Write a protein that binds this ligand. Structure first.
Ligand SMILES: N[C@@H](Cc1ccc(OP(=O)(O)O)cc1)C(=O)O
Length: 108
């Protein structure tokens, strides 16, 4: 499946629009989507809802780097062959993120 078939992939959605979808108070902590990065050409971003001890409802953004040789990572130590594999991995455990991925971002 191309990434575009995944319900968590929102392509060229802006960082701002992603926060609008994610900051809904109904969303469980760890609601997420994946999108193109607005600031790094070719890269992706993983946007995750959080409840911060100081800031309350908050959206965290993680940069997903792409290798021309194939593969994706947030940290170069932990590489995946696909965005689908990266999502599956972080859905199991936070492993450094603010929270594990729990919930595919609902639409409006
Ligand atoms: N802003 C993040 C890192 C980051 C940078 C860029 C990025 O892509 P975009 O510019 O589309 O949000 C995502 C995440 C941080 O403070 O750790």
């Amino acid at each position: 499946d191309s990434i575009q078939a995944e319900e968590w992939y929102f392509g060229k959605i802006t960082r701002r629009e992603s926060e609008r979808l994610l900051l809904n108070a109904e969303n469980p902590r760890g609601t997420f989507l994946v999108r193109e990065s607005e600031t790094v050409k070719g890269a992706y971003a993983l946007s995750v809802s959080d409840f911060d001890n100081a800031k309350g409802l908050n959206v965290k953004h993680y940069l997903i780097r792409k290798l021309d040789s194939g593969g994706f990572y947030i940290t170069s130590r932990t590489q995946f062959n696909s965005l689908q594999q990266l999502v599956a991995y972080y859905s199991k455990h936070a492993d450094g993120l603010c929270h594990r991925l729990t919930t595919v971002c609902p639409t409006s």
